[PDB]
C-alpha cells in the first residue's frame, strides 16, 4: 500500500521536464529519422509513474519534402496496466478517423531504471504486435524508451531487426534473461526532439487509460473507442475510485 | 547516469487563376461557369415601369359614408 | 505630502480583545455584602428600586398610537415605560436613535414602531402600501436572534402585506428573494461581505432604514465590522445625499455619548439612556467566582454551587440553566439529578408541583429518544440547538406552560425563543473558540442576552441571576452589568483589511480620502476623547487637534502592509492607491492579507491535489489551530487511510486541518468534541478560501489548477468526492440505492441510454427504476456546437451554440443554473478565454449563442478544447475539441502606406481663387494626409482609395475630388454615399454653405419618395444619399439616364461594408462599377474608409490602382490618441454599470480635469442616470459646481427654451446629456452649450455616436454592450461604432492629444486591445442577404439566366474576399474548382428559394423570369420573405383586423428593439387596444408592432420610447400596406383590397374605421364631435359648405384653431369623377372593354398632405378600381396621382355574354370620407 508514497513522489514529475537527454551519435545515418514534438513528451512524462511503466502508441506522417523523416503527430493512450518490467495493453490496435491519415510508427514507454540494452520484454511485445497486426511495418516502427534517471529523463529509440522479430514472436519466457536473446536483435534509430510543431493526444472514451488500480477490470480482449482529449495524470481521482469510496466506508 | 559519463553520446534538451468582373462574353481559364451543384389574372400596369374658401355644395350621395 | 510615520499596530492593539476592561476601579452598588465560602468568593447585589413615575408619565395605549400603526400591535394594550418614552422619536420623527436600555426592556417594540413609521410614510392612499418602494435592513449579532426577529416581524407585519426574510450564511450571488422581501435580518459580517461584493448598490437603492441591534458589541473583536459598516453607511449618506435613518439598540454602558456622536445622533433629541432601575423586572444578581484552580475539583465545585443554588428555590419557582455546549446540557441535568439523589437524599418530588399533577402530562410526552425520557418524568429537561429535532419545539411549550421546573439549555435558546424564567443561572462562562484554538471567556453580549431573561414580565416581581465563573480576573462582569464597562474600539487590529475593502469599493483613492474616511470610524472619536489609552500623548493631541498626523500615520502603515502583500500599489510620493486583482479577490472573499501572501507565494501552475490541499492547509485562518495530544490517536488513524496523501506533515497543524477537510468531504464522523468543532470551523472557512483560490487561479489563466480548484469547491459544497455517483447530489434518492449503483463499477454516462426497465434490472431493484430514470434526465447536461471562422491570421471568431439537454425542475435546479465556458490550448494548460454563462429557467430548453475571439499563434495548434463546466454540479461538464486540421488562415496583410514627410500644401495650391476662398479662412495648410493625397485626388482622374483614422479629414479629400469635377465640368454631377442617415444630414448641412452658397452649385439630399428623388437627381450637382435610397434609385439604371451619367461617385466609410446594412452598400458600389463598365464614360470612384488591413482587396474591387491606394496606419492621426482600457470582472450588467459609475468621475478628474468630456452609455435611461450620478459624485467632493464654466445668469436664457426638468437641473450644474427622446432643438442647444464651453461634460447614448457634431478632449465608453430583447441577451457594440466613438476624441486646433477610456467586461478587453490599435479587417455578408438583390436584378432583366447570376457575383466584394479568406465563407479551397462549385451552389440555393416563393420562374433549369410577387417586392423595396408571407396569409375575406396582424408580421419590423421591462408596459397596453391578439409573446417584435399600430390607430398616449418606436413603424407601414393592396388586387379579391386601402387611409389619419370622419380635423375632441353630431354635421364637406359665422357658433374657436381648421379644409380633396364606357352598344364577348374616366379637382391646391399624427410627409395617391361587389371580383385597378388634373383609362375583357353590373370605385390613401363609388352596367353581344 505504498501508493501514497509513490503518488507523493510522482507529484514532483514536472521538474524532470526541465532537462532531457536524447541518445545520439551511435545511430547509422542510413534509415529513417524520427522527430518527436516537445509538448507531447512533456505531457507523457508528467502523466507517468516512477515505478509503473506506461505506454502509448505513436502515429505520424512524413513531411511532404522528404520521406526519410517521420513526424510523430499523435500519441494514443489505451487501457493499460504496467509492472516495473512490462506494460500490458489490449490486443486491439487503436482505430479512429484522425488516425486514418497517420501511419503507425511504433510505441513509447517509460521505465524506472535506465538500461544500456533494450528490454527483452519490450522486444517480445513489439514482435507480438507486429505478428498480430500487419499494419506495423518491420522497419517503420520503433520503440521509444523514456528511462527515468536522477534529475532528468533519458530518451532513446530502437527498431527490430528481422532476426529479432523472428525471435520475439516465438519467445515465451518473460524473465529478465530469456533463452536465445542477443543484441543483434535490435538496432538504434535516430530521434530528435523538436518544438517547431505540436502533437496531440487521444484517450479512451467513457473510461480512462490507467488501469493499474482497477486491474481486475482489464482484459486483453477488451474493446475501446478513442476521443480527442488530453490524458489525466497517473494518480488522478478517476483512476483510483476505490481509495475514495473505501475511505467514505471508513 | 550515462549522460554524465559520456556527454558526447547524449544531447541535452530544455523542453521549455481567377477572372473578375465577368460578363456574358468571356473565355479562357478562370472564367467561372455555372454547373448544377448536384446536391395573377389581374394586370398591374405600374409594375415594370411606365382660409375657408366655401366652395359650392357638392352633389354628394356618391360617397361611401359607411 | 505631509510626513508619514510608521507605528506598530500590535503596540496599539488591545491584546485581550473582548476581555479588555478600562473601568479599573469598580464601584459596587448600594447592596454589596460579600460572602466568601473559602472555596469560591460570592458577590451579591440587590434589585434596584424602579424609578417613580414623573408628571404625565402615563403609559401610552395603542389607542393614542397612530391608527395605521395600530395594526401589528395586537396582544399589547399599552406600551411600556421605555417604549412609551421613545414613541415620539420612533414614530413622530426621523431622527437617528441611540437606545441604551437594560437587557429585556423590549427594544424590539421600538424597532417595530420605527418600521411602522417607515411603512406609514408609504401608505399610497387607496392602495394598501408601497411594498416595493422602500427597504429596511436589520443587523443582529446571532443567527438565532436573526430567525427569531424574522418570525416575530413577519407575524406582526403580515397585516401590512410585507415579507421579511433572513439572508445569512454563505450566500453568494443572492437571488431575487432579497428584492422580494423588505426587511432583511442578518449578521454584521454577512452584511459586510455583501457590501464588499460591490452589488450592494442595486439592493440599497431603496434602503432608508438600518437597525444596528446590540451595537454595544463594538468592544468585541467583531467590533471593527460594525465600525466599517457604520462608516460606509455614513459616507454613502453624505455622497448620495439620501437620508437613511440609523437606529442602534445598545446596552447601558459608559461612553454612550461617543457612540451617539459615532451614529450621528443628536444628544438632545436622539439619545435615550435608562439606567438599570428602569428594568421592567428588577433582579437580585449574584456572582460566584471559583478561587481554587484545581481543574478536577473545578467541575465538582461548580456542580455543588449549581445544586445548592437550585435547591433554594425548591419547586415553587422556575429555574433556567444556561450552558455553552450541546452535550454538556444532558451532563449538567444528570449530574444535578444524581447529586440531589445522593447528597442529603433530596428527592425530586420537591421540584414537582402539587405531587402527581402534571406529571402525567410530561409522562405522556416522555416518549422521546433525545434523552428527555430520562429527565421528563422529573422537573428536569434539556434544550439544545444541535441534534434536538422536534424535541426543541415541545420542550419550549412544556416549559412555557409552567410545567418544566428545571431547564438546562444552550445559549441559543436566549436568542431563538422568548421564554422567561424566575431565576437564571449561567455555568462555566468558558467557550471553546476554534479560531483562538483554546478556551476563551465568552462574549459579553451573549451573557447579557441570556441574563436578561431573569423574572417573568407578568408572573414575577423579583429576578435572580447567578453567574458562575473563575474568581481570578473574571469579576469584570461587575463592570459589565453595573453600567461601568466603557466601550472601546478594536479597529486597530483589523485596520488594513477595512482599508483594503474601502480601496476596493472605490470609496477612497488616496491617503487624503483614507484620512477623511477614518474620521467616521469610532476609533477616531475614541482617540479624540481618550488619547492616553491608545498611546496618544496630550501634547500631540493639543498640537494636532484633529489627529491628522496620527490618522495619516495609520493610513500609511496600513497602505505599506497592503503593498507588501501586493494587494494595493501605493506610491509614497503622491499617496495614491491602485487596486490589484489579488486585492479585489481578498476584499470580496474576506480573507486576511497573510493568507493572500501565502497563496501568492505557494500557488503554481503545476500544483497537484496533494500540494493544493497543503496550500489550503497553510492558510493563516487556521494559524491558532494546534494538534491536541488526546486527539492524536484518531488523527493518526485517519492519516493512514486518506484518498489524497498528505505531503510529509506527520503531526503539524497543517496535517490536522488537511485530514479534517478530507474527512468532512468524505462525510466521516469523529469522536472528539473539540475535533468536530474545529472541523466545522475549517469547513466554513474552506468554502470561501477555496472559492478565492479558484478565482485567483482562474484570473491567472492556469487551466489544470483551475479545474482542480473548481472540483474541490464543488466537492466541499456537495460533501462528496468526484469519484462517487453524481446522483448523490440529488438528496431525494435513498443512500442505499445510490450505494448499489456505486458498487457496480459502471460509468454514469452509459446510464442515459437505458430505459427505466433496463435501469431497474441493472440496479436489481425494478421498483426504483422509474425514479432513477427521472433523476437522470434532471441532471444538467449541455450539447455544444461550434462555428469557426478566422478573422485575421492571429485571431479566430468562435460562435458557440449551447443547447440544454435536460428536463428543468424548479425544485432541483432553481431559478437559474451557472456554467463556466473555458477554451484551452492543445496541452489544456492555458485558458485562452473564459466567461460566465447564466442559464435561466425562463429561457431554458432554448439554444443560446455565444461569440468570442481567441488568438492563434505561429505554430498552428492541432486543436483547441472548449469546456463548459457547471458552477454547482459535480461531474457535470462537456468538452468539445475544435479541430484546426482544415483551417486556412488569411493572407498576411501588406504594410500600410508610409506617411511621406512633405511640407504642407498651402491652400493656394488650388489654382482657382473661388476654391481657395472655401478654406483660406479655416486653415492656411492641410494636414500631412491631405497634402500627400492632394496630387492624386485633384490633378489625376483615376479612382483613388483613402484609408485614414477618423478625424484625419477625409472629407477634405472628397471635396478635392468634387472641386476637380466642378473645375473640369461646370455641370458635372457627383453622388456622395454615407451608410448612416445622421452622417448624411450632417454632411449635407456642412456642404450646403460651402458649395450652394459660396460656389452657387445645387446641393440636394435624397429622401424616401422616388419622384422627389428623381427631381433632385435631375436638378442636383451634389447628391447626398444613404445606401438604401440610392439603391432604390439606381436599380432601374437602364431607364433613368441621370443615374448613368454621373462624373463622380464618392463612398464614405466604406469599411462599414462589413457591418449590418453593409450588403446594400456593396451592391450599390458593384452596380456603379458595372455601370461604369457599360456606359463607356468612366465614373470616377473615390472611396473613403478607416484604416483597413486588407485595403488591397477593396482597391482591386473598386478599380483603384496600387499607386492611387492610400492605406494609412491608425497611428497616423494628426492628434495622437492615448487609449486606456479598463476591465470589470462582473457578469451582471446592472452591477457592472453601478460599479462603473464612480470610475467615470475618477477618469474625468485624472485625464481631463479642465477640458470637454463625452461619455457614451448604452441606453436612454442610463444617460440620465449617469448624468445624475456624475453630479452627485462631484457634489460629494468639495468641488461641487466644477463642470460649469459660465455664470448661471448666462445659462438662464438657454434653460428657458428647454422643457425637460432633469436636463435643466443637470445643465445648471455643468453636465448635460443627450438621447433620442430629446427634441432636435434641445439636442442642438445642448451641443451649442458644449461647443461654446459652458458645460464640460455631456452624456450621450450609443445610438448618437454618428449623430453628434461635437468633439471632446476625452471620450469615455461604458460597458460596450446593450441588451437585445429578441435574443434575451447582451450583445457587444460593433467595432465600427467603437471606432466612431473614439474618433470624437480629437480637437486638432486646441488639443495636443486625445484621450479615450473604455470601460468593459474583463473578457472583452483583449478584443479591444487587438482591434483598436491595428488596421481593421472587413469581410462581406452579401451571401446571407443575396435574395433581395438577385430578385431586383432578375426584375430589371440584368440576370436573364442562371449563368448571368454567377457572372453578377463576380463583380462583388464577396468574390474578392472568398479567395483571400475562404474559411470565413465556408469555403474549403481557393482553387478554381472550389470557387466555381461554391458560387454555383450559392446561386442555385438562392434561386431555388426565390422560385419556392413564386417570385421568379425557372425554365429549363437555366432561364429565369420575374413573376408578380417578385415584381411587387422589387417595386416597393420589400424583403422577399415578407411578400411570400403576404401571398400565403392573405385570402379572399381578410378584414382590417387580419390585415393589421399580417402587416405586423412583416420582416421589416424584425429589428424593432425590445428594451428592458417593456414587457409589463406592452402587456398593460394589450388590454387597452381594441383587437386583442391571442397567445402574445411580449418579447417578440411583431407583437409589439401590432400593439403599437393599434394604439396609434386609437390615438392612445404612451411612453416616449414607444412613440419613437411608433414613428419607425409608421415609416414602413405605408409601403407595406401598398404592397398588400397590390397583392390583393393581383388575385382579384375586391373586399380585401378595399379594406387595405381604407387601412392605409386610416393609418395616415390615425383613426379607426368606426370613428367619425371629423376626427381628422385638428383641435377636435370627443365633445366637439358630439356637438356637430347633434346638429347633423357628419362629414368634412359639411363644415366647408357651412357658413363662417354659422360654423363658428357650432364649436368654440380661436384664431389659430379656426385658421388651422380652414387650412385643412382647403387641402381636403374635392375631386369630381366622370366616367365613360367606350362603345357601350358594341361590346363583343371576350373583346376588350375600354372604360375612360376623367377626374379633376376644382380646388387646385398644392402642398403635402395634412397628417399631423403621421410623422413623415405623404402625397395623396388614388386607386381607380372596377369590380363586381356581387361576386367580390376585382376586375381591374389603376393607381395614379391627381396632380390637379388627370385622364386615366383602364380596360378589361368582357366576360361571357349578357348584361353585367359593375361598380367603379374611387379610393384614397390619405384622407377618409373622400372615397367615391359609382355603379354602371354594360351589355355583351
Residue numbers in the entry:
A (entry chain J): 2071 to 2320
B (entry chain T): 153 to 168, 198 to 220, 253 to 263, 303 to 318
C (entry chain B): 403 to 2127
Task: Give me lines lifted from the publication on this model.
For instance, the U5 snRNP 200 kDa helicase (SNRNP200; Brr2p in yeast) unwinds the initially extensively base-paired U4 and U6 snRNAs during spliceosome activation and releases U4 snRNA and all U4/U6-associated proteins, necessitating re-assembly of the U4/U6 di-snRNP and the U4/U6-U5 tri-snRNP after splicing. SNRNP200 comprises an auto-regulatory N-terminal region (residues 1–394), followed by a helicase region (residues 395–2129; SNRNP200HR) composed of tandem helicase cassettes (N-/C-terminal cassette, NC/CC). Both helicase cassettes comprise dual RecA-like NTPase domains, a winged helix (WH) domain, a helical bundle (HB) domain, a helix-loop-helix (HLH) domain and an immunoglobulin-like (IG) domain. Only the N-terminal cassette (residues 395–1324; SNRNP200NC) is an active ATPase/RNA helicase, while the C-terminal cassette (residues 1282–2136; SNRNP200CC) is catalytically inactive and serves as an intra-molecular regulator of the NC helicase activity.
Here, we show that TSSC4 directly interacts with the SNRNP200 RNA helicase and the PRPF8 spliceosomal scaffold, and present a high-resolution cryogenic electron microscopy (cryoEM) structure of TSSC4 in complex with the helicase region of SNRNP200 and the Jab1/MPN (Jab1) domain of PRPF8. Subsequent addition of PRPF8Jab1ΔC yielded a ternary SNRNP200HR–PRPF8Jab1ΔC–TSSC4 complex. We determined a cryoEM structure of this ternary complex at a nominal resolution of 3.05 Å. The cryoEM map unequivocally revealed four short regions in the C-terminal half of TSSC4 that contact PRPF8Jab1ΔC or SNRNP200HR, consistent with our interaction assays. TSSC4 region 1 (residues 153–168) lies along one flank of PRPF8Jab1ΔC, with aromatic and hydrophobic residues of TSSC4 (Y155, W162, Y165, L167) engaging in stacking, cation-π and hydrophobic interactions with PRPF8 residues. Region 2 (residues 198–220) interacts predominantly with the WH domain of the SNRNP200 CC via a mixture of aromatic stacking (F201 to SNRNP200 H1502, Y1761), hydrogen bonding/salt bridge (N202, Q203, R212 to SNRNP200 R1762, D1753, D1753/Q1749, respectively) and hydrophobic interactions (F215 to SNRNP200 K1748, V1789, M1808). Region 3 (residues 253–263) comes to rest in a groove formed between the WH, HB and IG domains of the SNRNP200 CC, where it engages in hydrophobic (V255, L257, L260 to SNRNP200 I2079, I1818/I2079, I1818/Y1821, respectively) and hydrogen bond contacts (H259 to SNRNP200 D1928). Finally, region 4 (residues 303–318) occupies a shallow groove between the HLH and IG domains of the CC Sec63 module, forming cation-π interactions (F304, R312 to SNRNP200 R1993, F1983, respectively), salt bridges (H305, R310, R316 to SNRNP200 E2045, E2044, E1944, respectively), hydrogen bonds (R312 to SNRNP200 S1981) and aromatic stacking interactions (H314, F315 to SNRNP200 Y2021, F1983, respectively).
